[PDB]
């Protein structure tokens, strides 16, 4: 298991513009296109992202390209973030995959927020970070995926994904 296969499971793959859980226009593997209510602002964002006139439809390859750029951007957002980096640097490789999952889904600003959990993760207080992470909108909105990420953080194993 790795961060790519982990996220591919959690986000699925979709070759046509679609709406995410929050109602936002998305495509491929969890690639947010826009928060605007326009299928047209979205077809616009999509085209600019792909470099061609897609008509709201992309291939596996294009989707994978987006995916790769987004995992890359999550990692880099973590490493640049003064709040995130040290927590991240302190973790093992499995747990790191979890942090990355969180960032890809909710953005660096969101996670950077989770102050208390961050502190407990760093202190390697596993059970408690898991309890605190659950007290969030995130968990309440997408509980099964959140449970998977949270077990990954708690345990340091890929159990939840096998
Ligand atoms: Cl992009
Ligand atoms: Cl879910």
Swiss-Prot record:
SUPFAM superfamilies attached to this UniProt entry: Lysozyme-like
Protein EC: 3.2.1.17
Active-site residues annotated for this sequence: 11, 20
Effect of residue 117 to V: 50-fold decrease in enzymatic activity
GO biological processes: cell wall macromolecule catabolic process; defense response to bacterium; peptidoglycan catabolic process; viral release from host cell by cytolysis
Recorded GO CC terms: host cell cytoplasm
Entry similarity comment: Belongs to the glycosyl hydrolase 24 family.
HAMAP family (UniProt xref): ENDOLYSIN_T4
Protein name: Endolysin
Taxonomic source organism: Enterobacteria phage T4 (Bacteriophage T4)
Gene: E
């Amino acid at each position: 298991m790795n961060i790519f296969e982990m996220l591919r499971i959690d986000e699925g793959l979709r070759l046509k513009i679609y709406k995410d859980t929050e109602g936002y226009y998305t495509i491929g593997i969890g690639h947010l296109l826009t928060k605007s209510p326009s299928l047209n602002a979205a077809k616009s964002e999509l085209d600019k992202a792909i470099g061609r006139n897609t008509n709201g439809v992309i291939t596996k390859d294009e989707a994978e390209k987006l995916f790769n750029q987004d995992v890359d951007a999550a990692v880099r957002g973590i490493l640049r973030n003064a709040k995130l980096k040290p927590v991240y640097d302190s973790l093992d490789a499995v747990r790191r995959a979890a942090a990355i999952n969180m960032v890809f889904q909710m953005g660096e600003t969101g996670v950077a927020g989770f102050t208390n959990s961050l502190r407990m993760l760093q202190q390697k207080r596993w059970d408690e970070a898991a309890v605190n992470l659950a007290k969030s909108r995130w968990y309440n909105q997408t509980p099964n995926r959140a449970k998977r990420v949270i077990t990954t953080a708690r345990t340091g194993t890929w159990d939840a994904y096998k």
